[PDB]
Design a protein around this motif. Structure first.
Motif, PDB file in Angstrom:
ATOM      1  N   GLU A   1      14.234  -3.049  -8.471  1.00 22.06           N
ATOM      2  CA  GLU A   1      13.498  -2.492  -7.526  1.00 22.06           C
ATOM      3  C   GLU A   1      11.825  -2.590  -7.832  1.00 22.06           C
ATOM      4  O   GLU A   1      11.518  -3.185  -7.572  1.00 22.06           O
ATOM      5  N   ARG A   2      12.156  -1.780  -9.222  1.00 23.35           N
ATOM      6  CA  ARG A   2      10.417  -2.090 -10.037  1.00 23.35           C
ATOM      7  C   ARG A   2      10.489  -3.265 -10.063  1.00 23.35           C
ATOM      8  O   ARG A   2       8.644  -3.699 -10.065  1.00 23.35           O
ATOM      9  N   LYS A   3      11.098  -4.175 -10.565  1.00 21.66           N
ATOM     10  CA  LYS A   3      10.410  -5.808 -10.998  1.00 21.66           C
ATOM     11  C   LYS A   3       9.979  -5.938 -10.067  1.00 21.66           C
ATOM     12  O   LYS A   3       9.030  -6.998  -9.580  1.00 21.66           O
ATOM     13  N   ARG A   4      10.669  -6.084  -8.410  1.00 18.53           N
ATOM     14  CA  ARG A   4      10.114  -6.466  -6.910  1.00 18.53           C
ATOM     15  C   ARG A   4       8.902  -5.830  -6.640  1.00 18.53           C
ATOM     16  O   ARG A   4       8.165  -6.499  -6.509  1.00 18.53           O
ATOM     17  N   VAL A   5       8.433  -4.808  -6.604  1.00 18.16           N
ATOM     18  CA  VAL A   5       7.165  -4.208  -6.620  1.00 18.16           C
ATOM     19  C   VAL A   5       6.582  -4.015  -7.724  1.00 18.16           C
ATOM     20  O   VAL A   5       5.222  -5.044  -6.819  1.00 18.16           O
ATOM     21  N   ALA A  10       1.030  -7.888  -8.923  1.00 23.24           N
ATOM     22  CA  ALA A  10       0.654  -8.534  -9.141  1.00 23.24           C
ATOM     23  C   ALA A  10       0.342 -10.150  -8.238  1.00 23.24           C
ATOM     24  O   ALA A  10      -1.432  -9.908  -9.010  1.00 23.24           O
ATOM     25  N   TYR A  11       0.573 -10.350  -7.496  1.00 18.25           N
ATOM     26  CA  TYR A  11       0.743 -10.964  -5.958  1.00 18.25           C
ATOM     27  C   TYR A  11      -0.308 -10.587  -5.719  1.00 18.25           C
ATOM     28  O   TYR A  11      -1.713 -11.459  -5.726  1.00 18.25           O
ATOM     29  N   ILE A  12      -0.314  -9.697  -5.455  1.00 19.09           N
ATOM     30  CA  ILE A  12      -2.271  -8.255  -4.557  1.00 19.09           C
ATOM     31  C   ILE A  12      -2.951  -7.923  -5.529  1.00 19.09           C
ATOM     32  O   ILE A  12      -4.262  -8.737  -5.311  1.00 19.09           O
ATOM     33  N   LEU A  13      -2.956  -8.177  -6.220  1.00 23.25           N
ATOM     34  CA  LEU A  13      -3.938  -7.808  -7.862  1.00 23.25           C
ATOM     35  C   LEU A  13      -4.950  -8.739  -8.486  1.00 23.25           C
ATOM     36  O   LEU A  13      -5.643  -8.488  -9.347  1.00 23.25           O
ATOM     37  N   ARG A  14      -3.808  -9.913  -8.246  1.00 21.49           N
ATOM     38  CA  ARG A  14      -4.230 -10.196  -9.207  1.00 21.49           C
ATOM     39  C   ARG A  14      -5.270 -12.239  -7.474  1.00 21.49           C
ATOM     40  O   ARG A  14      -6.035 -12.386  -8.700  1.00 21.49           O
ATOM     41  N   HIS A  15      -4.254 -11.736  -6.885  1.00 22.32           N
ATOM     42  CA  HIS A  15      -4.047 -13.477  -6.324  1.00 22.32           C
ATOM     43  C   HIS A  15      -4.793 -13.309  -4.600  1.00 22.32           C
ATOM     44  O   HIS A  15      -6.119 -14.063  -4.379  1.00 22.32           O
ATOM     45  N   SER A  16      -4.367 -12.689  -4.070  1.00 25.80           N
ATOM     46  CA  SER A  16      -4.339 -12.473  -2.512  1.00 25.80           C
ATOM     47  C   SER A  16      -4.501 -11.803  -2.386  1.00 25.80           C
ATOM     48  O   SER A  16      -3.677 -10.497  -1.214  1.00 25.80           O
ATOM     49  N   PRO A  17      -5.146 -10.352  -2.198  1.00 28.25           N
ATOM     50  CA  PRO A  17      -5.090  -8.933  -1.718  1.00 28.25           C
ATOM     51  C   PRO A  17      -6.161  -9.320  -0.333  1.00 28.25           C
ATOM     52  O   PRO A  17      -5.396  -8.458   0.310  1.00 28.25           O
ATOM     53  N   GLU A  18      -6.457  -9.843  -0.043  1.00 22.20           N
ATOM     54  CA  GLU A  18      -6.918 -10.505   1.349  1.00 22.20           C
ATOM     55  C   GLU A  18      -5.583 -10.724   2.277  1.00 22.20           C
ATOM     56  O   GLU A  18      -5.859 -10.071   3.290  1.00 22.20           O
ATOM     57  N   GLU A  19      -5.038 -11.206   1.907  1.00 16.64           N
ATOM     58  CA  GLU A  19      -3.977 -11.391   3.193  1.00 16.64           C
ATOM     59  C   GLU A  19      -2.829  -9.454   3.382  1.00 16.64           C
ATOM     60  O   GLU A  19      -2.555 -10.228   4.619  1.00 16.64           O
ATOM     61  N   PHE A  20      -3.385  -9.171   2.718  1.00 18.53           N
ATOM     62  CA  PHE A  20      -2.731  -7.486   2.895  1.00 18.53           C
ATOM     63  C   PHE A  20      -4.206  -6.423   3.507  1.00 18.53           C
ATOM     64  O   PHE A  20      -3.963  -5.305   3.576  1.00 18.53           O
ATOM     65  N   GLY A  21      -5.315  -7.272   3.722  1.00 11.11           N
ATOM     66  CA  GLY A  21      -6.551  -6.705   4.247  1.00 11.11           C
ATOM     67  C   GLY A  21      -7.419  -5.847   2.767  1.00 11.11           C
ATOM     68  O   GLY A  21      -8.234  -5.234   3.289  1.00 11.11           O
ATOM     69  N   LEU A  22      -6.575  -6.067   2.008  1.00 16.58           N
ATOM     70  CA  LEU A  22      -7.955  -5.706   0.875  1.00 16.58           C
ATOM     71  C   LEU A  22      -9.121  -6.786   0.162  1.00 16.58           C
ATOM     72  O   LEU A  22      -9.086  -7.799   0.641  1.00 16.58           O
ATOM     73  N   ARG A  23     -10.243  -5.887  -0.245  1.00 20.83           N
ATOM     74  CA  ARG A  23     -11.369  -6.936  -1.017  1.00 20.83           C
ATOM     75  C   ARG A  23     -11.174  -5.528  -2.161  1.00 20.83           C
ATOM     76  O   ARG A  23     -12.142  -4.682  -2.269  1.00 20.83           O
ATOM     77  N   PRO A  24     -10.775  -6.714  -2.953  1.00 23.42           N
ATOM     78  CA  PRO A  24     -11.699  -5.567  -4.825  1.00 23.42           C
ATOM     79  C   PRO A  24     -13.030  -5.583  -4.764  1.00 23.42           C
ATOM     80  O   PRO A  24     -13.436  -6.780  -4.596  1.00 23.42           O
ATOM     81  N   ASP A  25     -13.394  -4.644  -5.186  1.00 27.05           N
ATOM     82  CA  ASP A  25     -14.668  -4.520  -5.713  1.00 27.05           C
ATOM     83  C   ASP A  25     -15.314  -5.850  -7.135  1.00 27.05           C
ATOM     84  O   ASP A  25     -13.972  -6.716  -7.549  1.00 27.05           O
ATOM     85  N   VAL A  26     -16.006  -5.664  -7.800  1.00 25.39           N
ATOM     86  CA  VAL A  26     -16.557  -6.188  -8.509  1.00 25.39           C
ATOM     87  C   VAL A  26     -15.563  -6.716 -10.011  1.00 25.39           C
ATOM     88  O   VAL A  26     -15.319  -7.682 -10.624  1.00 25.39           O
ATOM     89  N   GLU A  27     -14.907  -5.828 -10.186  1.00 24.18           N
ATOM     90  CA  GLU A  27     -14.081  -5.179 -11.850  1.00 24.18           C
ATOM     91  C   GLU A  27     -12.717  -5.467 -11.159  1.00 24.18           C
ATOM     92  O   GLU A  27     -12.034  -5.453 -12.094  1.00 24.18           O
ATOM     93  N   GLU A  49       3.560   7.706  -6.978  1.00 22.65           N
ATOM     94  CA  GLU A  49       4.364   7.849  -7.896  1.00 22.65           C
ATOM     95  C   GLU A  49       5.032   6.659  -8.866  1.00 22.65           C
ATOM     96  O   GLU A  49       4.869   6.333  -9.558  1.00 22.65           O
ATOM     97  N   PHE A  50       5.464   6.147  -7.782  1.00 24.68           N
ATOM     98  CA  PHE A  50       6.297   5.057  -8.420  1.00 24.68           C
ATOM     99  C   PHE A  50       5.574   3.738  -8.818  1.00 24.68           C
ATOM    100  O   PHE A  50       5.531   3.903  -9.356  1.00 24.68           O
ATOM    101  N   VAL A  51       4.386   3.485  -7.983  1.00 24.01           N
ATOM    102  CA  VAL A  51       3.902   2.669  -8.885  1.00 24.01           C
ATOM    103  C   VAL A  51       2.699   3.054  -9.524  1.00 24.01           C
ATOM    104  O   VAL A  51       2.987   2.276 -10.975  1.00 24.01           O
ATOM    105  N   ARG A  52       2.682   4.539  -9.857  1.00 21.19           N
ATOM    106  CA  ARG A  52       2.064   5.618 -11.198  1.00 21.19           C
ATOM    107  C   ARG A  52       3.309   4.857 -12.048  1.00 21.19           C
ATOM    108  O   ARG A  52       2.549   5.064 -13.583  1.00 21.19           O
ATOM    109  N   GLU A  53       4.280   5.489 -11.840  1.00 18.10           N
ATOM    110  CA  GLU A  53       5.416   4.781 -12.971  1.00 18.10           C
ATOM    111  C   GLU A  53       5.040   3.475 -13.334  1.00 18.10           C
ATOM    112  O   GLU A  53       5.738   2.916 -14.976  1.00 18.10           O
ATOM    113  N   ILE A  54       5.264   2.701 -12.463  1.00 20.49           N
ATOM    114  CA  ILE A  54       5.403   0.624 -12.512  1.00 20.49           C
ATOM    115  C   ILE A  54       3.953   0.785 -14.231  1.00 20.49           C
ATOM    116  O   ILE A  54       4.214  -0.028 -15.203  1.00 20.49           O
TER     117      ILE A  54
END
Length: 177
Positions: A1-5, A10-27, A49-54
């Protein structure tokens, strides 16, 4: 489970945030709330909290949390202004890659390919593990860091062992093993 999440993060935060409607700041940061809601559209049992654990338990230093914001530290395929510290002490850095890539690398150097930066490592094992993710006959590239610095390519401390650099000219690859 941890590895899937963690993989979906990593997909959302490195490559395709916009597919989930997210817009990262310049950093490269998005809000933690945003990330959690995004993850819950795929894995509804996910919680902040599960994400904080990851993040706390990640063995490579993949992720970073500043207050209520989270990013990936490296690996991005879209423009990010990262504020990582410079690696000035390493003498040698390592990059593992399938042997089939070596002719091209010997001609062109390491190139960032689909990502913003070339990724290398201070750790031989981690470099080889990364290479082996791509295919079978992995070569360990030894890179003269001071060669890079001399040519104006500063190296930055992106994870525990992970280092990022603009490119690695072929003159700075001392050995392929």
């Amino acid at each position: 489970e941890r590895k899937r999440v963690s993989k979906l993060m990593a997909y959302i935060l490195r490559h395709s945030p916009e597919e989930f409607g997210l817009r990262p700041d310049v950093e490269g940061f998005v809000s933690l709330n945003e990330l959690v809601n995004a993850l819950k559209t795929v894995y509804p049992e996910v919680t902040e909290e599960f994400v904080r654990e990851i993040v706390e338990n990640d063995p490579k230093g993949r992720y970073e949390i500043r207050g209520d914001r989270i990013r990936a530290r490296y690996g991005h395929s879209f423009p990010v202004s990262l504020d990582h510290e410079e690696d000035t002490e390493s003498r040698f850095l390592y990059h593992g890659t399938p042997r089939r890539n070596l002719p091209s690398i010997l001609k062109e150097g390491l190139k960032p390919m689909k990502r913003q930066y070339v990724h290398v490592s201070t750790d031989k094992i981690e470099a080889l593990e990364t290479g082996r993710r791509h295919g079978r006959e992995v070569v360990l590239l030894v890179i003269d860091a001071e060669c890079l610095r001399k040519r104006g390519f500063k190296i930055y401390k992106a994870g525990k062992n992970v280092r990022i650099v603009e490119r690695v000219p072929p003159d700075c690859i001392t050995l392929a093993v």
